[PDB]
Design an enzyme around this catalytic site. Structure first.
Site, PDB file in Angstrom:
ATOM      1  N   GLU A 209      22.260 -30.109  -7.043  1.00 27.47           N
ATOM      2  CA  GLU A 209      21.364 -30.225  -6.331  1.00 27.47           C
ATOM      3  C   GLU A 209      21.913 -32.280  -5.629  1.00 27.47           C
ATOM      4  O   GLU A 209      21.237 -32.581  -7.212  1.00 27.47           O
ATOM      5  CB  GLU A 209      20.593 -30.068  -5.554  1.00 27.47           C
ATOM      6  CG  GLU A 209      20.667 -30.026  -4.428  1.00 27.47           C
ATOM      7  CD  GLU A 209      20.035 -31.655  -3.607  1.00 27.47           C
ATOM      8  OE1 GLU A 209      18.463 -31.805  -4.532  1.00 27.47           O
ATOM      9  OE2 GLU A 209      20.005 -31.996  -2.513  1.00 27.47           O
ATOM     10  N   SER A 210      22.621 -32.227  -4.984  1.00 24.98           N
ATOM     11  CA  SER A 210      22.643 -34.238  -3.895  1.00 24.98           C
ATOM     12  C   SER A 210      23.315 -34.997  -5.692  1.00 24.98           C
ATOM     13  O   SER A 210      24.338 -33.976  -5.636  1.00 24.98           O
ATOM     14  CB  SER A 210      21.539 -34.473  -4.169  1.00 24.98           C
ATOM     15  OG  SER A 210      21.310 -35.687  -3.981  1.00 24.98           O
ATOM     16  N   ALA A 211      22.717 -35.892  -5.901  1.00 20.47           N
ATOM     17  CA  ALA A 211      23.047 -37.165  -6.994  1.00 20.47           C
ATOM     18  C   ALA A 211      23.089 -35.208  -8.165  1.00 20.47           C
ATOM     19  O   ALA A 211      24.072 -36.307  -8.901  1.00 20.47           O
ATOM     20  CB  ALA A 211      21.720 -37.505  -7.150  1.00 20.47           C
TER      21      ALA A 211
END
Ligand code: NAG
Ligand code: NAG
Length: 539
Positions: A209-211
């Protein structure tokens, strides 16, 4: 209501804890502690048995650059209640000695089992985060209850200056993108040792998730798309929650060299013969101070990150958009999605960015060194100034935190996550037409004041059990189906077929109590500009 359990494996032995039907081993060391003359160096595998390790606790975390609390005062008020989401949590037991992972499995699993593996890479803006707050018990229990058991793996990787420090000095020493190498070496560790734990190493699905999500793409892209270790693929599937291609300037570019030089100065290594070598002699505290002295993610600069993966010519060979375009990533079946309002969180702080000219300046100063004012103005002009057109999308006259908030949030969300995703799907479909992909848009937090369905709300929907709604059961079942069969529709019965993206360019839109299928073509003019000019958007 619990017991301990030992696993003996080729590199050592761990003691874990069995409770609630799940056996957990937290803090399994996977590479040598990146300390002393190994700080700011690639991770290296252990060369000899580590004996018997106590993994009944929670593991360590890597050194953190915690969110600015003076800066985020309003932001942290706006999330209210949801401040208890892992991104906003504080890591504990932080240390340079942090290259460890967690293994969680169904009770009864032995080394004769060969379960599919789910390999989790946390998000945290490449500057903070840890595996400590992502527990697999609820998700494993769901998997078991679907008749589809698996093994959960969650890793630490170095972040901030410890993992993504750049410059010509870092590039020549071959120490670019250490955080990525940390993720990679854990995959190879898994390949070597997961069978001892009952995992099928040929059935590894990476998920982030995200990064972490961006990292998942980079792992596909790593080494020119060579994900093979000892002749075999390190993974067979990817799941990307918010984030994929992040076009970037080189590790020895201007932005990165400036960060580096600032770090050296703040460390007290200014003007030494070999600065990088000197950096390793600095005490941990003075060093931590140096690498944290640069802007964070909760700040005016926002998603113009100080630390991130940058092209080094070996690990990442080109800028991410070029890696796809050149058909040089490991093309695996993938699921990728976004929260509807990805940008809202990042538009809170820069509350003076209140017009087109101001948006364009902000971009020209902090973000895109290769775009012209005419180009940036043209892109910003695809976004109406009208209060109803912005993010939180589809909320009319509501949620305008300051004049221009919804517009800026729309733009920030689109170029980094939501429209960048469509570009990614489009390109992948062009070079690798035969490799299937599925995509969703998340809307189950529609109405959340000022933020709408914002960045990382998906965490609440998959890590905390099956919520009393449509969305969490729906999502977890697809994900586990995928981990098991390489196709989210195959496995446990589902109540809506999720269309493959390349078929009609449709996606699944997931609300709190229902799902619908929609065309991935909203904000088309903004998307066309982005896709046609992606090179100028290198951060
Ligand atoms: C916005 O405000 C900040 C800090 O007050 C400043 O650094 C920045 O230059 C300002 N930008 C504009 C367009 O006013
Ligand atoms: C700008 O574009 C050029 C053309 O190749 C490239 O060499 C340079 O690294 C780019 N810099 C940035 C920040 O995009």
């Amino acid at each position: 209501e619990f017991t301990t359990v030992n696993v003996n494996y080729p590199e050592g032995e761990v003691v874990g804890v069995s409770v609630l039907g799940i056996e957990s081993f937290r803090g399994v060391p996977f590479a040598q502690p990146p300390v002393g003359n190994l700080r700011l160096k690639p991770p290296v595998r252990y060369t000899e048995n580590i004996g018997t390790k106590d993994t009944t606790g929670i593991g360590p975390s890597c050194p953190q650059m915690y969110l600015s609390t003076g800066n985020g005062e309003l932001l942290f008020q706006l999330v209210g209640n949801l401040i208890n989401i892992p991104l906003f949590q504080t890591a504990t037991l932080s240390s340079e000695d942090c290259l460890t992972l967690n293994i969680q499995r169904p009770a009864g699993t032995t080394s004769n089992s060969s379960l599919p593996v789910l390999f989790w890479i946390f998000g945290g803006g490449f500057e903070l985060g840890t595996n400590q707050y992502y527990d697999g018990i609820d998700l494993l229990t769901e998997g078991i209850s679907l008749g589809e058991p698996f093994i959960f793996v969650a890793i630490n990787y170095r972040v901030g200056g410890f993992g993504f420090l750049g410059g010509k000095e870092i590039k020549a020493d071959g120490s670019s993108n250490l955080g990525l190498l940390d993720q990679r070496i854990a995959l190879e560790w898994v390949a070597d040792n997961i069978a001892s734990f009952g995992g099928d190493p040929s059935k590894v699905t990476i998920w982030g998730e995200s990064a972490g999500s961006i990292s998942v793409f980079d792992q596909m892209a790593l080494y020119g798309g060579n994900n093979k270790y000892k002749g075999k693929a390190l993974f067979r599937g990817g799941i990307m929650n918010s984030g994929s291609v992040v076009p970037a300037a080189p590790v020895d570019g201007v932005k990165a060299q400036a960060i580096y030089d600032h770090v050296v100065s703040e460390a007290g290594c200014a003007g030494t013969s070999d600065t990088l070598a000197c950096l390793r002699t600095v005490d941990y505290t003075k060093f931590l101070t140096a690498v944290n002295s640069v802007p964070g993610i909760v700040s005016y600069s926002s998603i113009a990150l100080s630390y991130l993966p940058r092209p080094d010519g070996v690990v990442l060979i080109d800028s991410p958009e070029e890696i796809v375009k050149n058909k040089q990533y490991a093309a695996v079946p993938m699921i990728i999605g976004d929260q509807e309002d990805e940008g809202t969180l990042f538009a809170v702080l820069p509350n003076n960015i209140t017009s087109t000219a101001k948006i364009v300046q902000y971009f020209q100063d902090l973000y895109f060194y290769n775009a012209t004012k005419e180009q940036l103005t043209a892109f910003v002009n695809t976004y109406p100034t009208d209060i109803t057109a912005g993010s939180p999308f589809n909320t009319g006259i509501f949620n305008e935190l300051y004049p221009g908030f919804k517009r800026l949030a729309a733009i920030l969300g689109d170029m980094t996550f939501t429209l960048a995703r469509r570009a990614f799907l489009q390109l992948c479909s062009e070079v690798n037409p035969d490799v299937p992909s599925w995509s969703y848009l998340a809307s189950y937090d529609y109405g959340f004041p000022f933020l709408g369905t914002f960045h990382a709300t998906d965490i609440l929907q998959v890590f905390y059990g099956v919520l009393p709604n449509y969305a969490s059961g729906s999502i977890q079942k697809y994900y586990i189906n995928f981990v098991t069969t390489g196709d989210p529709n195959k496995g446990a019965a589902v109540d809506i077929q999720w269309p493959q993206w390349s078929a009609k360019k449709n996606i699944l839109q997931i609300y709190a109590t229902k799902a619908v299928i929609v065309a991935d073509n909203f904000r088309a003019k903004s998307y066309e500009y982005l896709y046609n000019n992606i090179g100028i958007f290198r951060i």
